[PDB]
Design a protein around this ligand. Structure first.
Ligand code: MG
Ligand code: MG
Ligand code: MG
Ligand code: MG
Ligand code: MG
Ligand code: MG
Ligand code: MG
Ligand code: MG
Ligand code: MG
Ligand code: MG
Ligand code: MG
Ligand code: MG
Ligand code: MG
Ligand code: MG
Ligand code: MG
Ligand code: MG
Ligand code: MG
Ligand code: MG
Ligand code: MG
Ligand code: MG
Ligand code: MG
Ligand code: MG
Ligand code: MG
Ligand code: MG
Ligand code: MG
Ligand code: MG
Ligand code: MG
Ligand code: MG
Ligand code: MG
Lengths: 54, 118, 97, 46, 114
RNA sequence: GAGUGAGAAUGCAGGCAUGAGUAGCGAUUAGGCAAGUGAGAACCUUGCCCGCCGAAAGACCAAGGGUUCCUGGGCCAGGCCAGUCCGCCCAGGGUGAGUCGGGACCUAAGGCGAGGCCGACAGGCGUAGUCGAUGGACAACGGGUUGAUAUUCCCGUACC
């Protein structure tokens, strides 16, 4: 099948506006004397020293 | 262990067999590797089965580990320095820690390594 | 008019790492006009440098084809000549290393 | 599984068949060369 | 009116709406949160936008001597630019075109006292 | 005085939209890990296993293309992705024969053709001849070389 008419400004932009991204929260951890930021997935790893952050 | 529920990781049974054997050998040879996070998840059972076999040193376990992972060097190091070193520890032989996502395709990588606390 | 002289042929010597790999082995490299011949170049080098040469090898290098916005560019075709002096071994000081 | 295409080049065919001399051998070819030269093509013959 | 500085990077090899996806996540935030979000958002467009934000912060700090802790992103937007034109062979020897898109990125930074 | 007024002729040329960030990313072989360079590494470099072809998916030639060969530099443009990589692009270098392939040797099918025949004309024929290999006569090996070239360069021994 094919479209037969041009879908309007409102329809196109309204459909497109739902596609976005979500900003996550950050976690401060005290390692090596510096407080650096990880997601909560890495809190234990950061405290023990098992995750590499550039 | 429980099989991977979905379509298999690498794309066929022989392929994942070879892949998992190579991952187990390289991980046991080195100590700390960085790989795809679901790959490490599926790696955990195999390395843990090897640790189970290693705990009880004998000829049958020699041959079992050989037929599993195909390297005299890695099986020797496994039976000589890894085996007795986990004598008093029951389960929990590997640690999974994920790291920054890959640049190539944004796949989540995890660093999987032996526990060296004891 | 014009008379026949042997050293109306040599264009230049060529300097390269291979040219030095040959200069160590008493074998030289020269740039020669296309319409020449090994006999003419032999007589020319003998007469000009007072050295008795054994044999001369010649090769043709087709011109390259270099990009340019104006259009399709082609350089000129050149002929290199490999010459080997005899066991007398008289270095040519005019080569300038 | 036939997929062999029409154009199978050979520079020897090309030159003996659409060559300047095959043009000049016949009067029609001379007429064609003259027409092309009047037009002002860069490459007179293949 | 408040002091402000601007910085842009044109001819960036990303799609307009695809960079705008990331750009919609930084409007109105402070520069520190902006840098954090761009670092932690896994998108290709996150790199050029973060570079533009970093450059704008550097310009504001150097040229006008402003304190970075109080800078916030005033307006950020991406506009489509010249599109590279290519051709792709498709089935049955019939040919379609490929529009290689390119986008502009504009960042202006405003210093708002707490 | 007019090439003088467009909204349409599945009009013409240029530009830009939606379908849309949707389908596809080019096979019957399959990778993973470590160390190294790099601002960035599944994709490049080096090491170990695994996988596939192996009358080929290996190694040479002819026809064909012409610098895609090697080295060094850089990665906006091209590679269906990033790419330090490339058959990308910039510069430099690289092809060595009395004996390997053609001409100075000769012919097949066939082409050209002095004179000549025929044809208003343009022309078409074919004799003497001259062209025309996919044919025939006539002269090599082992090893070594650097970062790329070897039956060509060097060593050793010969040929016609
Ligand atoms: Mg010669
Ligand atoms: Mg060019
Ligand atoms: Mg990123
Ligand atoms: Mg009119
Ligand atoms: Mg109009
Ligand atoms: Mg119209
Ligand atoms: Mg139509
Ligand atoms: Mg559309
Ligand atoms: Mg779909
Ligand atoms: Mg798809
Ligand atoms: Mg393909
Ligand atoms: Mg890598
Ligand atoms: Mg096979
Ligand atoms: Mg076969
Ligand atoms: Mg066979
Ligand atoms: Mg050929
Ligand atoms: Mg050729
Ligand atoms: Mg190359
Ligand atoms: Mg380079
Ligand atoms: Mg580039
Ligand atoms: Mg491109
Ligand atoms: Mg180049
Ligand atoms: Mg005739
Ligand atoms: Mg006549
Ligand atoms: Mg005849
Ligand atoms: Mg002939
Ligand atoms: Mg012949
Ligand atoms: Mg060769
Ligand atoms: Mg050879």
């Amino acid at each position: 099948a094919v479209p037969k008419r041009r879908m309007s400004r409102a329809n196109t932009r309204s459909r497109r506006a739902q596609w976005k991204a979500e900003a996550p929260g950050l976690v401060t951890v005290s390692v090596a004397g510096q407080q650096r930021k990880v997601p909560r997935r890495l809190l234990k790893a950061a405290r023990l020293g098992l995750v590499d952050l550039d | 262990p429980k099989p991977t529920k979905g379509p298999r990781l690498g794309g066929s049974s022989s392929h994942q067999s070879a892949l998992l054997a190579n991952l187990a050998t390289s991980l046991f040879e080195h100590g700390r590797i960085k790989t795809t996070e679901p790959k490490a998840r599926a790696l955990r059972p195999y390395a843990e089965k090897l640790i189970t076999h290693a705990k009880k040193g004998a000829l049958h376990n020699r041959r079992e580990v050989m037929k599993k992972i195909r390297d005299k060097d890695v099986v020797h190091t496994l039976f000589a320095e890894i085996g007795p070193f986990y004598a008093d520890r029951n389960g929990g032989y590997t640690r999974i820690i994920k790291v920054e996502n890959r640049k190539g395709d944004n796949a989540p990588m995890a660093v999987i390594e032996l526990v060296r606390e004891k | 008019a014009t008379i026949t002289d042997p050293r109306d042929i040599i264009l230049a010597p060529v300097i390269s790492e291979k040219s030095y790999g040959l200069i160590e082995d008493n074998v030289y490299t020269f740039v020669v006009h296309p319409d020449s011949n090994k006999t003419q170049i032999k007589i020319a080098i003998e007469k000009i440098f007072d050295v008795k040469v054994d044999s001369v090898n010649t090769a043709n290098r087709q011109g390259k084809r270099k990009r340019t916005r104006t259009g399709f560019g082609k350089r000129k075709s050149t002929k290199r000549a490999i010459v080997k002096l005899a066991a007398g071994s008289k270095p040519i000081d005019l080569f300038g290393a | 599984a036939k997929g062999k295409r029409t154009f199978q080049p050979n520079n020897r065919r090309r030159a003996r068949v659409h060559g300047f001399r095959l043009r000049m051998r016949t009067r029609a070819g001379r007429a064609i060369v003259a027409n092309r030269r009047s037009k002002g093509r860069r490459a007179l013959t293949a | 009116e408040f002091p402000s500085a601007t910085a842009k990077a044109r001819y960036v090899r990303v799609s307009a709406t695809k960079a705008r996806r990331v750009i919609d996540l930084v409007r109105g935030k402070s520069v520190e949160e902006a840098l954090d979000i761009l670092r932690w958002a896994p998108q290709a467009a996150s790199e050029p936008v973060a570079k533009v934000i970093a450059s704008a912060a550097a310009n504001a700090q150097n040229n006008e001597g402003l304190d970075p802790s109080t800078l916030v992103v005033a307006t950020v937007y991406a506009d489509e630019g010249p599109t590279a034109k290519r051709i792709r062979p498709r089935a049955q020897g019939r040919a379609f075109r490929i529009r290689k898109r390119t986008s502009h990125i504009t960042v202006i930074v405003e210093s708002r006292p707490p």
